[PDB]
Symmetry: D2
Subunit: 119 residues, 4 copies
């Protein structure tokens, strides 16, 4: 029992809202980040993702298409039943900044973790 639908808050402070997961595992939702590496308005954004499909703790993966910037973030993790019986999503992401030349690409990728809980 680890539905992906719902509202979740992360260690960095953000909030993530996911909808009803279908049969092929997909889903959609909004993701208000609580942190920014830019100078723009922290404006909400939609995230698209899929979750494997029969174990209780399935690994998923989604893309959050930010609205206030030319960037994308990709999280990938697994739904765990944190010992007592509370769900906990541990994930990792790659923050893709945008450049102008096919040269300054390396300085474009950032990596970090993120633990989500049911806010």
């Amino acid at each position: 029992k680890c539905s992906l639908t719902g509202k979740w808050t992360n260690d960095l402070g953000s909030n993530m809202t996911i909808g009803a997961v279908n049969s092929r595992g997909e889903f959609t939702g909004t993701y208000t980040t609580a942190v920014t590496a830019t100078s723009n308005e922290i404006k909400e954004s939609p995230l698209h993702g899929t979750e494997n499909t029969k174990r209780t703790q399935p690994t998923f993966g989604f893309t959050v298409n930010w609205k206030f910037s030319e960037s994308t973030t990709v999280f990938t993790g697994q739904c765990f039943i944190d010992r007592n019986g509370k769900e906990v999503l541990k994930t990792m992401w790659l923050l893709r900044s945008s450049v102008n030349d096919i040269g300054d690409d390396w300085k474009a990728t950032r990596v970090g973790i993120n633990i989500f809980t049911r806010l």
Copy 2:
């Protein structure tokens, strides 16, 4: 530069992305040539291209849901136009493996790079 078409990366793996809808969203299929070794196979991958500020070289992020075995991959990158007037997808990914328990999570994620071109 658009993620519509048949793409092959540097590992020998192909991938086709059908039409990138109004909003951003897009679908396709992925045929890898490697693995952590069951059988190779296609799987469905869905993504999203970042429109905002109507570029020609935007960042994108798609999730490949490996059917065989409980994996996922996520690719994050930018649609380029390398100086040969051709196209080039420069991206890094994260391969999440399904792990037995919450406390064996530290070892589930793998990081690497891939570069898709056209065929």
Copy 3:
């Protein structure tokens, strides 16, 4: 804040760094509590703290050479001073596995996070 002392991270693993020489360099031992599963064990790790601009919270980078099995790890992070006036090592790492051939390289690196404190 200095990398001198006995440190334990969030995985149950300890680590001790002897004296950080004039230049930067420093040595120590690492005792993990996990693995990709031979036996657990200590191994020697050497690092380097970045002096330039004489800070108190500088970045560092040390390489743990896993003797048992042909691995490596590398940790990159910053010596912090979290608001409890205590210390905190916030770092991410890369675990490289020895692979049979050049063309099976894409799957050798793993990415994750660790946070060492004091004892």
Copy 4:
């Protein structure tokens, strides 16, 4: 036969010079980067690392303590005999930028690849 000593050039354009590797696998050298994510003088710097120790293609790991900035980079990879009989070092690195608060840590880590050859 894959000695680590010597001068190597990387895909990004940089040059790396490594010295004599000892018995415990360690080594030292300079590393002139050919790219910078800052506004400083691209000034040379020393890198410290170790290499496992009996296979022909051993995996290593080193830290490059940059001189023109409060930062550290950590590479980790493996020495491969590129088919014909030329050595080739494939590696990955984590570029650790420095922050001021134990909060803005996530925006601090960058990841990317790097292939070295005997310039």
